[PDB]
RNA sequence: GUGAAGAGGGAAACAACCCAGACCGCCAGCUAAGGUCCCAAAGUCAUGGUUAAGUGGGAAACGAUGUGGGAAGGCCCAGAC
RNA sequence: CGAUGUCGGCUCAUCACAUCCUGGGGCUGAAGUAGGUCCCAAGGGUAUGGCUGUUCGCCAUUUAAAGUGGUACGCGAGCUG
RNA sequence: UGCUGAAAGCAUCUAAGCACGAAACUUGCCCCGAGAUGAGUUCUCCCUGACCCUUUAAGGGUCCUGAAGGAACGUUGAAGA
């Protein structure tokens, strides 16, 4: 594929 | 005209009457005899061909002793040619001495660069260097980007990359000429040339007003 | 036509010599000269000279008509020869001419010196006038036209190298 | 029976000299390329080489039609950076003229590799003679 | 000089002329009427 | 209508356009579209015209003594432009 | 959509020309100094700072000038985040 | 921007012909460069023994010979991964 991003 | 053969011995002042420091790049000029001359007729071109050292005759092979059998021997360190125009000079080992630069007043001088070996940008091409600091990861003296996406898709020629610096030709051009001493085969002209102490010089006169 | 279809007297002491294409005039004065035609057919005999188009060239007439006009002022030219006259305006126009070459102060920080070319020869009047005679019609104008160069008549005093049969704007300034 | 094919062990070739100088190029070419690629014998064989060495003359002197000769536009490109060069067919026929002809018929010449070889038989000397003479070169028109 | 795409005479004296493959607009009186892109 | 579920030739390359519907073999022949100077199979074909622009081989209003053809008209050796 | 890292900066660039400076011109309501505008010109050159994440913009102070655009709004298997 | 100049009795830088004309173009300056397979030129140096076989030809082989030079090794360099 995260969910890290753009978005 | 035709220029000659020399030898970087290399850098020191001299001072003047009024007080001035000329920085001289001292040029030993052993004189230059010509092995060969060479002519539109055994084709091409009008100039002429030197040596000037001396080498050991153990060092001498057959084809190159054999060339300077044509002409007054005594082997010298190389060759060199020199283009001609409208100057004649006949082969007889006929011998250049440094008299030739006694009315010269400019001389360009030609060397081989030190050399670096590799450099890399920011010392090659004086890439700036990137933050030293400021999170940077391990890009500090790297070349950063070196081309743009998809559409040129590829890196163009002649990129200013990391390689090989220097031990290469360069010359220097103008350079006034501050003395001339036969029976010395001295030549200082103002100022540092190109290539390490003790290594091969040219020196012609300039071509540049 | 017309110009073409006229034809042109040769003038008692002229030589003419036709070659193929090449006409070549010498009179009284001037160094013969000698052109080049194409499409053109020239046709001598008689005291005279007549130009006509040549089978094929649609190009023919126009040509023929310069032809006929060219070779008139050869003629023209070798016998009574051309004229030329030009004259300075503007505080330190000077003009001098040493053999064939004119020398002009015009206002510049350095002199000129034009050299005449080679049919062509010069005479001052005064400082300030330029005649210059000569046979070839197209450089005695060429000549002229790079004398009034070195200062085109500017139009708010008049100032420079003018012709005589100029005509010369002139505008009122207004400052500012 | 297979029909029959030329064989590169054993072709005939013979040389000719060719006079470029009022001839319009290309025109000229045509007949160039064709006899370089043997299509006026048994050329019946796309896969050799069956034409003549043909050596031209006067390629300076070649002519051209139309304003061709100021505006023909001739360019290259030097692999680099933004090398764009061109030349116009004047300068060209200026500077090493019989470049001019031989493009010309390279062009006309079949892509590759036999292509290449071919136009190795075509002589274009700038000038009026041809150092030759031992080839024996017959003359020929068109 | 003035250029445009509509060129045409203005003065009595503006005379029109096919130079090269460019026509333009020659005026003896009035400089202010040269044309050009024709 | 075609492609989808259709190969083949043409349109430089281009499912859908043009011509045309491949049961298998043939180193026979005639054609379709499209072509016939060279790459490249076939006209450097015949006759009569036009264009000078590489127009052909990208584009409008509009501009202009480019140039070919046609019908009619005005002024002219009482001398026209 | 069985994954084409998206803003700005940094480093490095590269083309176009609708040219900011430098070069060559026509016209000017061009006296001169200096401008305006159109034409030709892409060879080279084309600012450091304050504020803000900014690009930008405003401001300070320079400069011959501080050009407009394309390049996945160039540049995450180069950095920053 | 011109000169000369008809087509078009004139005018016209242009259709023939001639002259000017810019950091753009081709050169001049510096560097690379004959894999430039279109592989170029010039000077110099070196090798002048015997003999056999077959399908007998840019044919294969035996003894002698081993050059000019090169490379290797060593001591090494303001040359260098
Ligand atoms: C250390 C070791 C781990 O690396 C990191 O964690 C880096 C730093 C992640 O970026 C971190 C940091 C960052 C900024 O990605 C760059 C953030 O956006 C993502 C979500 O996580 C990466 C790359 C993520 O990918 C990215 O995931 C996005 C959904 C799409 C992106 N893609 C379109 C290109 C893709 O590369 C992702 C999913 O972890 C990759 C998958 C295969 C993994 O799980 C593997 C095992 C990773 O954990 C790893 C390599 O072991």
């Given at each position: ?7 | ?209 | ?176 | ?105 390279k062009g006309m010449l079949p892509k590759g590799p036999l292509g290449r070889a071919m136009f190795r038989k075509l002589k274009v000397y700038a000038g009026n003679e041809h150092n030759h003479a031992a080839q024996q070169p017959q003359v020929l028109d068109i | 000089m003035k250029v445009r795409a509509s060129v045409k005479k203005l003065c009595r004296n503006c005379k029109i002329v096919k130079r090269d493959g460019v026509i333009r607009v020659i005026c003896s009186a009035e400089p202010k009427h040269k044309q050009r892109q024709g």
């Amino acid at each position: 594929i995260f969910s890290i991003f753009v978005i | 005209m035709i220029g000659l053969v020399g030898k970087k011995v290399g850098m020191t002042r001299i001072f003047t009457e009024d007080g001035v420091s000329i920085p001289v790049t001292v040029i030993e000029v052993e004189a230059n005899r010509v092995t060969q001359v060479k002519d539109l007729a055994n084709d091409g071109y009008r100039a002429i061909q030197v040596t000037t050292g001396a080498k050991k005759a153990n060092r001498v092979t057959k084809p190159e002793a054999g060339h300077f059998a044509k002409a007054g021997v005594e082997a010298g360190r190389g060759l060199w040619e020199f283009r001609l125009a409208e100057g004649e000079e006949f082969t007889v080992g006929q011998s250049i001495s440094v008299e030739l630069f006694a009315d010269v007043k400019k001389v360009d001088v030609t060397g081989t660069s030190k050399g670096k070996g590799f450099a890399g940008t920011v010392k090659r091409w004086n890439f700036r260097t990137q933050d030293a600091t400021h999170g940077n990861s391990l890009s500090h003296r790297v070349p950063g980007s070196i081309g743009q996406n998809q559409t040129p898709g590829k890196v163009f020629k002649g990129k200013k990359m990391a390689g090989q610096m220097g031990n290469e030709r360069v010359t220097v051009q103008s350079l006034d000429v501050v003395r001339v001493d036969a029976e010395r085969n001295l030549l200082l002209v103002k100022g540092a040339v190109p290539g390490a102490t003790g290594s091969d010089l040219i020196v012609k006169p300039a071509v540049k007003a | 036509s017309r110009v073409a279809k006229a034809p042109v007297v040769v003038p008692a002491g002229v030589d003419v010599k036709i070659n193929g294409q090449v006409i070549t005039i010498k009179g009284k004065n001037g160094e013969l000269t000698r052109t080049l035609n194409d499409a053109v057919e020239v046709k001598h005999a008689d005291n005279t000279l007549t130009f006509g188009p040549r089978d094929g060239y649609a190009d023919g007439w126009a040509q023929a008509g310069t032809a006929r006009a060219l070779l008139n002022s050869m003629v023209i030219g070798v016998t009574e020869g051309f004229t030329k006259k030009l004259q300075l305006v503007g505080v330190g126009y000077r003009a001098a001419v040493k053999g064939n070459v004119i020398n002009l102060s015009l206002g510049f920080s350095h002199p000129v010196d034009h050299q005449l070319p080679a049919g062509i020869t010069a005479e001052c009047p005064t400082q300030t006038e330029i005649v210059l005679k000569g046979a070839d019609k197209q450089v005695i104008g060429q000549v002229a036209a790079d004398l009034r160069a070195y200062r085109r008549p500017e139009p708010y005093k008049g100032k420079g190298v003018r012709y005589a049969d100029e005509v010369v704007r002139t505008k009122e300034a207004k400052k500012k | 029976m297979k029909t029959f094919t030329a064989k590169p062990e054993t072709v005939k070739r013979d040389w000719y000299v060719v006079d470029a100088t009022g001839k319009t190029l290309g025109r000229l070419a045509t007949e160039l390329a064709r006899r370089l690629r043997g299509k006026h014998k048994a050329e019946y064989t796309p896969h050799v080489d069956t034409g003549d060495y043909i050596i031209v003359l006067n390629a300076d002197k070649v002519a051209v039609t139309g304003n061709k000769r100021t505006d023909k536009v001739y360019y290259h490109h030097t692999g680099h950076i933004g090398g764009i060069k061109q030349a116009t067919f004047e300068e060209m026929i200026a500077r090493r003229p019989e470049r001019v002809i031989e493009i010309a018929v390279k062009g006309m010449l079949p892509k590759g590799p036999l292509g290449r070889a071919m136009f190795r038989k075509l002589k274009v000397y700038a000038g009026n003679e041809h150092n030759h003479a031992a080839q024996q070169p017959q003359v020929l028109d068109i | 000089m003035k250029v445009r795409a509509s060129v045409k005479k203005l003065c009595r004296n503006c005379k029109i002329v096919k130079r090269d493959g460019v026509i333009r607009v020659i005026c003896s009186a009035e400089p202010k009427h040269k044309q050009r892109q024709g």
